[PDB]
Amino acid sequence: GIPAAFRWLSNKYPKIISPVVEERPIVMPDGTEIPVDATRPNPNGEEFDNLYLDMNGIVHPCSHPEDKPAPKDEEEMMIEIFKYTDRIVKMVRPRKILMIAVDGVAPRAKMNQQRSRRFRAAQEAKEKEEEKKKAFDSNSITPGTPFMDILAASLRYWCAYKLNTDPAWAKLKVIISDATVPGEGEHKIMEFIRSQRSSPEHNPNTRHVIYGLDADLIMLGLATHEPHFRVLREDVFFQEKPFIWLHVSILREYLAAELEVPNLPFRWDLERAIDDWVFLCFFVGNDFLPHLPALEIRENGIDTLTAIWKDNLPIMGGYLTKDGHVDLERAQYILNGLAKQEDAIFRRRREVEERREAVDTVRLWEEGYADRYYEQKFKVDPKDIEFRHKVGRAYAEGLAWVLQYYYQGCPSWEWFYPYHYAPFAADFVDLAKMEIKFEKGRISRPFEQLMSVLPAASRHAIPEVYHDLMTDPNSPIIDFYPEEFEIDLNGKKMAWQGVALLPFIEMPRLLAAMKEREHLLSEEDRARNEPGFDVLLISDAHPGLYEDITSHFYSKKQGAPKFKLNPRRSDGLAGKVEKIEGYVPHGSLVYPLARNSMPDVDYDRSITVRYIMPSSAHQHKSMLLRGVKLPPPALSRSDIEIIRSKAKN
Ligand SMILES: [Mg+2]
Ligand SMILES: [Mg+2]
């Protein structure tokens, strides 16, 4: 999540946005809506092969809508989720692949972010009920909760149902990675794209679409280096219910003109430049690192960085980034160049705030702000300078972590930046002497992840055997679950902005307390605490791939219960599939919810198998694959010269 990053990019680079042409259903005089024929050519001018759904962006608006009355129970929420997701698929009309990615158990660095936004939701709910002196807890949208089990069963039904009914899903391969499969929803998509890209049969001109509002999807869309890539998102700025595209192909054109440097001692490569730009944007903040005090998106902090990056690029000897790895020796140039401007940036910020008028105790525009900053925000010794360097090394370690996470997959499931504030650029010293080594670490179980991201007010979603650890004042880990906590606005104006001063979980303590109680879990709960897997769903009308899996798995002359996919028989899908035990195909598709508001299908035309992404030793390369054909340029010489003339300022 990068707040204000979208409002910034769309203002600076306007041509990356275009409206989504959505065909609407015809409504009968009797009221019956006639569904949209999604087999007809896509009215957006192009045909999209793959559509990836960051699914939690659909679950949140349909469960706690801010604009309409909230649904009456979970079943009506699933119905809205069906209607919303169907509307999206009727818009994109994917022709080959459709991935449903629900947030699974995430790395420790993301869990601390999830812990923050979930602790705040509990306090907002308490403060909005004390002002009124059981609703749906938004924190149920968390991996491993009872709510996610309802959602998993509902998406399995709805996909099989659409494979049966909608004639535009015949050749469509549906991949469902539910909340029992570890991995952040954005990065389960990102890892699937990397796996297909490394396939020898892969189409270099695949048209990708990813859905979600998380600004991380823009960065990841750039990190794939698949040119034919769009981001589908709701027109959040609709004040004066539609959707908009964000053309990563066009954003690449804007970054081409924004970053091009004449006369370099080394070869200029737009692909390697985009990587450095993505790396540079980590400094303005995201889910894993705080923004540096000098860098704010609303202050053109990205422009400050790209300026310093262009000034140092000839003398660096090369780029900052190569395929997800950082040359910290070169990154030293960037931070040295920002430290020289920190003093002046804070002053320019105060001069703006003084003209906006015509309490702050740090006073970044006054001499000695660094001693006040660590004294009041980090709440440490201002005289301890080595501590400041440590925070710098911690932040630099985090930059290397996020870059590998985005480009090659999570390098450490246990690492996390252990401070609530960022250091100054002046505090990054001797970065060339760092030797960063990441251990993959231990992935959390669903219940452990729950205890790591939920507050005590949401313990309903947690097995009762653990509740005493969150509420008993004599609990050995009660210091992890405060009922009240301070939120530092840090100069910002709104309450959703700012830092939540929550203690960081010492994970060995939490795991030790949960192990002492695990033998009391029910047999159904022990099974819920185990990792699931991805599944592929196709219809019996999918050419080749359906005939293949019925032969290997469900014929009379069955062979191995797992075989690799040939991308010529499947519609370009690479990887292995495994037979699901206890599953007989073509039975009766039964609607899982109680009120039977969706039909049972007596003969299920769909078939479900376990899907296994390909895993190659060849890393994800930041390059244009052989055989790619770039889209015709969207920017004009007028466009380019405007971006260049402004970039010189
Ligand atoms: Mg994210
Ligand atoms: Mg997410």
Author numbering: 2 to 134, 159 to 265, 305 to 422, 569 to 859
Please quote the paper that reports this structure.
In this work, we studied the structure and dynamics of the essential 100-kDa eukaryotic 5′→3′ exoribonuclease Xrn2. The molecular basis of RNA degradation by Xrn2 and its cytoplasmic paralogue Xrn1 has been established by several studies. On a structural level, Xrn1 and Xrn2 share two conserved regions (CR1 and CR2) and a less conserved C-terminal segment (CTS), which together form the Xrn core domain.
To lay the structural foundation for our NMR experiments, we first determined the crystal structure of CtXrn2. The active site of the enzyme is positioned in a pocket in front of the ‘tower’ domain helix (helix α4). In our structure of the Xrn2 enzyme, electron density is lacking for three regions: (1) the top of the tower domain (residues 135–158) that is also less well defined in other Xrn2 structures; (2) the linker region between CR1 and CR2 (residues 423–568) that is highly flexible in solution; and (3) a short loop between residues 266 and 304 that harbors a putative CCHC zinc finger (ZnF) motif. The precision of the extracted population is limited, as can be judged from the shallow minimum in the reduced χ2 surface. In summary, our data reveal that the apo Xrn2 enzyme is in a dynamic equilibrium between the pre-translocation and post-translocation states.
